[PDB]
Amino acid sequence: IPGYTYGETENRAPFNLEDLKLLKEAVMFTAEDEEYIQKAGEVLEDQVEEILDTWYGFVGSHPHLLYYFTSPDGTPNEKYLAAVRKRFSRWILDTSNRSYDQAWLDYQYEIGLRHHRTKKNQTDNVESVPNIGYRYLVAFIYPITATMKPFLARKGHTPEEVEKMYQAWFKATTLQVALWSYPYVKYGDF
Amino acid sequence: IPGYTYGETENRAPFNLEDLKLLKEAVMFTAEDEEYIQKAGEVLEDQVEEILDTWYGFVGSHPHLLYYFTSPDGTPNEKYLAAVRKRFSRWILDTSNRSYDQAWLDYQYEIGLRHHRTKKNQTDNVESVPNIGYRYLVAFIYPITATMKPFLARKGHTPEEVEKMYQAWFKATTLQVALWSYPYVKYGDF
Lengths: 190, 190
Ligand code: HEM
Ligand code: HEM
Ligand SMILES: [C-]#N
Ligand SMILES: [C-]#N
Ligand SMILES: [Xe]
Ligand SMILES: [Xe]
Prior knowledge:
The structure is a homodimer of 190-residue chains.
Chain A: H1 17-26, H2 31-44, H3 48-59, H4 63-66, H5 84-95, H6 102-113, H7 134-139, H8 141-146, H9 149-152, H10 161-180
Helix pairs in contact in A: 2-10, 6-10
The complex binds protoporphyrin IX containing FE (HEM) (2 copies), cyanide ion (CYN) (2 copies) and xenon (2 copies).
Residues 59, 88 of chain A line the site of one cyanide ion.
GO molecular function (chains A, B): heme binding; metal ion binding; oxygen binding
Protein name (chains A, B): Globin-sensor domain-containing protein
Pfam families (chains A, B): Protoglobin
């Protein structure tokens, strides 16, 4: 997979392993979540393909959003919309499968920079908008969540065991997007 | 109410009214939410009091969190933990009642600065930690949400009409916290 530099970042995560403990705590993540995430994962793996479509159906309906993929002239750099689509789809099962250990943190950091102007579009060789406005990152917590509820219950799951899956996806996202802000935030305020 | 400077900000919201349209869209907020928020509101008003306790029960259980209220020596500046508690409780019904118009935006901005080192603790005359690390703001999306589900259904509401209330609270938070980041983010990256 092209540009998937997981574990081969080799520039350290300027946030430590203790940090994720305190943040996990803020986002109320308990080991009792760890089970249902992995479950959630195995719920989604097979179905993954349809998920990217639903989600791409969304970004695609909004211009102020799709713009963030468009070449300098304002039309979607698709060699760039098939290379992200790939890495992101690696990510969903990475959220249901990697243990949240240091290298997972090395790369949470990397994905911030990839949204940031520090390292947006370098990976994928394309010419496109300079930076992604952080406001939308935060925003993407809701759709990336809501749109997931339906999928979690299609492979047949009781209405309260599913709730624990969604509830786990919810927390897992907020936590991530939380760490991504580093290159966005003025030093000392993160 | 002391320090509740809603509508008497008189320094403009450096984000405009168009901005909230595009962001509302990212956070998937439709007029069909506008109804259930106000509903949610009238669900919560009476119950408000207990809500601050539950929530204060939480921040209070975590030191890395409560620290953000403590005097320079490291013990909770309570004249500061009774003055916030007040303004915040004005806020819940402000989220269920103000229409999201320009002055509502003037003050969303204000509340960022109040979390930021630009204007943290000035309002309330206390001596305390310089800045609130933005990572926790993002994080506070989950508890401020999860802890709300139970309350929304206590005043007797069917299991699918309630879901629309929570779903509306969810979106309404992400949106807010989204705007608060302005003083935190390096200029041009917001
Ligand atoms: C909930 C917040 C978001 C999540 C979870 C998310 C997810 C992802 C993932 C997993 C990747 C690939 C990372 C990898 O290399 O493995 C990615 C890249 C990318 N995403 Fe996001 N995304 C979010 C917010 C946004 C928003 C709001 C936009 C604007 C439409 C956006 C546009 C992009 C772009 C342009 C890249 C390419 C990075 C580069 O330039 O190299 N993302 N995203
Ligand atoms: C979901 C995100 C959050 C929400 C919705 C929220 C809510 C609020 C509200 C409504 C106020 C009063 C605003 C007013 O003046 O009317 C406030 C103030 C305050 N909150 Fe937050 N809060 C969040 C995140 C946090 C976090 C993570 C902390 C750290 C424990 C924190 C600590 C404080 C402090 C220290 C103030 C006082 C501002 C000052 O210094 O004047 N908040 N918050
Ligand atoms: C990212 N979509
Ligand atoms: C703010 N609690
Ligand atoms: Xe998704
Ligand atoms: Xe709350």
